[PDB]
Enzyme design. Sequence first.
Site, mmCIF file in Angstrom:
data_model
loop_
_atom_site.group_PDB
_atom_site.id
_atom_site.type_symbol
_atom_site.label_atom_id
_atom_site.label_comp_id
_atom_site.label_asym_id
_atom_site.label_seq_id
_atom_site.Cartn_x
_atom_site.Cartn_y
_atom_site.Cartn_z
ATOM 1 N N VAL A 15 0.825 -1.206 0.000
ATOM 2 C CA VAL A 15 0.000 0.000 0.000
ATOM 3 C C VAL A 15 0.851 1.244 0.000
ATOM 4 O O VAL A 15 1.750 1.401 0.850
ATOM 5 C CB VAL A 15 -0.908 0.027 1.249
ATOM 6 C CG1 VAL A 15 -1.733 1.277 1.315
ATOM 7 C CG2 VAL A 15 -1.754 -1.244 1.344
ATOM 8 N N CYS A 16 0.630 2.125 -0.963
ATOM 9 C CA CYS A 16 1.220 3.457 -0.965
ATOM 10 C C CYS A 16 0.280 4.459 -0.268
ATOM 11 O O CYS A 16 -0.729 4.889 -0.851
ATOM 12 C CB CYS A 16 1.486 3.870 -2.397
ATOM 13 S SG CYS A 16 2.390 5.370 -2.602
ATOM 14 N N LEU A 17 0.606 4.812 0.969
ATOM 15 C CA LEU A 17 -0.164 5.692 1.841
ATOM 16 C C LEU A 17 0.876 6.714 2.289
ATOM 17 O O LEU A 17 2.002 6.359 2.680
ATOM 18 C CB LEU A 17 -0.726 4.925 3.034
ATOM 19 C CG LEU A 17 -1.494 5.739 4.072
ATOM 20 C CD1 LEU A 17 -2.843 6.268 3.550
ATOM 21 C CD2 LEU A 17 -1.703 4.896 5.323
#
Length: 156
Positions: free
Chosen positions: A91-93
């Site tokens: 996940v790119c958060l």
Amino acid sequence: SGIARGRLAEERKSWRKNHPHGFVAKPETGQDGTVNLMVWHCTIPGKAGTDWEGGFFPLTMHFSEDYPSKPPKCKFPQGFFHPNVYPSGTVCLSILNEDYGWRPAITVKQILVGIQDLLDTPNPADPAQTDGYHLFCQDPVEYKKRVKLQSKQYPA
């Protein structure tokens, strides 16, 4: 036990005292029964009234001994469909970016709630997969179909 494990025990205690309904977060159980504080298996429910509704999405959080100075890595299953999720599942958060986002006081709950919001509110500045990102931007009808379908893959 070191800083990371001390903090993860605090996170566990807090989570068990108070967490949002329908979420799960806990340290993984190893093959012989031994709990591993450094890898958590979590579940993030889709919000009612979104195309994610009715899904219960499995998210693994991976901590290092550099935590909490450095962020965990969070992963959905490989192949998960979302504009901000890599083919690997990562996940790119923005708060998971060590240099440009992370603050060490952010809690496990705060991470999981941030990811929950990200599901129906993607960050257009972080394309991470071609499938999910291409549909999202300029093809909302097909994107919606794909999200609704994926929610059926994650019951219960």
